[PDB]
Design a protein around this ligand. Structure first.
Ligand SMILES: [Zn+2]
Ligand SMILES: [Zn+2]
Ligand SMILES: [Zn+2]
Ligand SMILES: [Zn+2]
Lengths: 307, 307, 307, 307
């Protein structure tokens, strides 16, 4: 298909509340962020939950109980639940929302890696909540763990529930890790490969980095994968644009970037969706509907989730 | 400078009038086309002249005599004259407009090559004028000659007058050909390098082709060049977008593509300038004014031309 | 096949006899060079003729009349005749030897280009014959002409005799030119693609240049091409090695480089064949025999030529 | 310098003794392996220790006590100690040898990653010691931890003893992680960058993977890094060859590959040094002596160590 799938990651677990008043924190804010992103043109909504009180990341399925059914009734957009949450968290817990809610899509980080969030402390030096500075400073000695055993376990369990994955690949090794699983017939096509650029601990944001992730994926998966680009921070729209211009899909959201322009905070997820849509439109491309995305990605349908 | 220079090539010598009623032909059309593109945001107007009776290319300086002053009186956009014109034509004669008019910019094809235009005879079967079919078929057996001696001659002759060049580079060899002249101290920075993609006889339009040209230019010239992208035909906006997303400048225009969208003919050069501007705006980038383009390219000034 | 085909180009038309006493000139020297290179392991001998009195290039078939049958009676190596000769020569004159001798292989330059030989005048300043300096200096205003019409003519005329081609591609555009002919069905597989690096007027000799020719050829031709590398001068063995290590075939010979090591003239063609064989053996690869080359390239056989 | 530094990794912690009777286990074997490699041309010996009763990896400084002085007394080859050892082991234990012996070089893995060793159980089914199968199977569920804090600690601690590092970069993210520390001035040039290809959990062995690692490094470090290539298993010689041909340094050894040719076990480490030297010689390059490698790498000297 020539339609462009816009995934919008509304809040995540990396950014903290003190960085931007626009980062969704409460169940209502997450729901509104999502419906607005979807209304703006996002076919897939990539969701994390946070504590309505202080915004700290939470993977308790309780935290999703309110917004999921609310999003589902307010938009046909595809709900995509994180199996990652915060890198500080631990496995099997991380999988509760996905295992409980049995979503059409869940995110799967394709390899253990460092996540260097501490440099954000050079831009943000004062925080409303104590957990914020800690979350960033402790990133320095934490490993985001997704071993070959962890990945196999997620694939079997969630796959068993009709849940397909957004394979988050932060470097060439992640595409090769995915290839390993594909060869073992543990994942079935099409593979939704979200190539992530610009995070310390992952591949950088250079145009050469993007071209290499594409040539690798093309060589390893051929016609069996569906490509999406995720550029962190300021690289969000330019890397998405480069990919859009050559047939890729795009991912935006306050989870990945807090900005709408140099030195200007994005007020809503929808704003970012709008901006990538101006590029998509200039390229004479059309944005994919949730129905189109479901077809392109081989998803189970909204009537088949536990919510 | 983070500003994007938009070059608009208004008519050229490749397309023929029977392929689109919007291709400018007469001096008034060429002038209106240029003025409108400049007002849409083009800082540089790349110009060829056509015979007003049948639209065939002509490098007779008399053919530019009316439209040149008319453009100059209505816009401060930089006038860029071609030193090629038609590959059917010969050298030093090819230089008459640039040597006479002493423009701020002149284009310079960086190497002898084949120009395969004959395949257009498969989309366009009926022509109003006899020359059109012949122009296209005769490209099969002709070489666009730009020898190392010819290039040296153009660099010396036009450069002596303060004319700077739009170095038209159709393949890697052209970049290496320019480095040869830079190493002989026959060209001085900044080098306005227009990498041209998608013409039979030149490099193709794949994203790998574009990344190759950039990495070569980066290695050969470092910070001493100013990069512009020209994608032929349907590749105009996609390749320009890829470049613009990574700091490059852009070239549009009916000389290069007759289209505004799939199967939809562009009514004006301005429309193509508006189309690439949606992408430039999506990227939160600004368009360079003619004054800014002059500074970026080291040009002599709108008043310092012989028209 | 994992066997490596070694082509040896014994004299060429670029180098001049005053540059090295080891450059073959007379029919006896050419035959000895050829036989020696075949005995060293070259399965393909790429041939030009020179005038025995002064070494000047000549495409007169009479100039090949002695050495050709002598090489044929002494080795089963594949004889590959140039259709390029000297770029100073005219076309169809260039074709006399290949059309008369109906060889198994003929070289075919895939596009018009500049051929800058004049910088060699900076290293070689004394010449025994006046034509030598002239040959070099005059390359400055020379186009090496191989229009789309010329290539079509050679393909049809030589191809009609069962002659297959060593497609000499000096840049990306040449690979795209070849795909144009493959699509029009004017050339049948396998395609023996000789990617040529390091000639002024061609693509350079950077590892990036080699990697780009390969990825382009792979995309355009898939499994239908047989790849060979030709690195000019000092790049001969380094580039051939980078290629051999990833499945390529290799071209060596005094036509392409006069050197065996830095500042050290190669005394024979054989010496260069032995140097690449050292690399091939280090890689645990084997050299293809003439019979094996013939199978890999679909050749008509040593007895099926007109000499 | 155009001299090639050959690093020989004599045993490592990946391979198990049941895999090859030639894998060095005892102090005597390690020392003779190291001296033979140096005699064959290795300027740098990359060392791990094994428990001599069962060959299991051990980072007890006591396991190095005999071989280090034996090696130092018989060769000037630079001693390079591992800081990884077995990915099963912990961090304080990992650093004892380097911190105690204060070698001129120590290896430093540049990012936490999965190490997929379990596929080797498809080739090796029978093991002499119980630890061997467990070593391989437990790789499925273990992370090789090298956090941003860990790396900072190693740089400060070992750096303080004059020890310089062989930065083992298994993917693009590792080069970027090194750039982070270089920007923080926590490592001084020249940086010995050992790019590692072909391990499940790291970047693969494709020529493109290699070109991208060089392009990334060239861009991040410019002239401030010294490049070495490590291809795992069968990719050992081809990838080293590709690097050697373009000015890089090379790494061989039974730690990295058990083979000397397809299906033929390497009898010694020295056999592998000889094999890459066939390529080096074919390329007309010379091997660096230990004195030369010390200059190239800015090393402290063979007597400035604690053994
Ligand atoms: Zn997420
Ligand atoms: Zn033009
Ligand atoms: Zn030749
Ligand atoms: Zn090691």
């Amino acid at each position: 298909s020539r339609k462009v799938i816009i995934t919008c990651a509304v809040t995540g677990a990396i950014h903290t509340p003190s960085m931007s008043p626009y980062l969704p924190v409460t169940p209502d804010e997450v729901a509104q962020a999502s419906i607005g992103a979807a209304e703006a043109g996002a076919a897939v909504i990539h969701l994390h939950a946070r504590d309505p009180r202080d915004g700290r990341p939470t993977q308790d399925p309780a935290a999703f109980a309110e917004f999921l059914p609310r999003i589902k009734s307010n938009t046909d957009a595809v709900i995509n639940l994180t199996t990652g949450g915060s890198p500080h968290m631990t496995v099997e817990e991380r999988l509760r929302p996905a295992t409980h809610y049995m979503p059409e899509l869940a995110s799967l980080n394709m390899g253990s890696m460092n996540f260097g969030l501490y440099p954000m402390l050079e831009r943000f030096k004062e925080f409303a909540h104590g957990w914020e500075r800690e979350h960033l400073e402790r990133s320095r000695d934490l490993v985001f763990k997704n071993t070959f055993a962890d990945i196999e376990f997620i694939l079997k369990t969630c796959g068993g529930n009709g849940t397909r994955f957004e394979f988050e690949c932060y470097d060439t090794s992640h595409l090769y890790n995915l290839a390993h699983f594909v060869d073992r017939k543990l994942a079935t096509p099409p593979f939704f490969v979200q190539t992530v650029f610009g995070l310390l601990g992952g591949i950088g944001p250079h145009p050469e980095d993007l071209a290499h992730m594409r040539r690798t994926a093309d060589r390893l998966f051929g016609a069996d994968y569906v490509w999406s680009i995720l550029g962190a921070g300021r690289h969000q729209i330019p890397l998405a644009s480069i990919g859009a211009a050559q047939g890729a899909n795009v991912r935006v959201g306050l989870e990945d970037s807090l900005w709408i322009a140099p030195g200007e905070l994005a007020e809503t997820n929808a704003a970012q969706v709008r901006k990538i849509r101006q590029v998509i439109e200039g390229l004479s491309l059309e944005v994919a509907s949730p129905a189109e995305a479901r077809t392109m990605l081989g998803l189970k349908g909204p009537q088949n989730v536990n919510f």
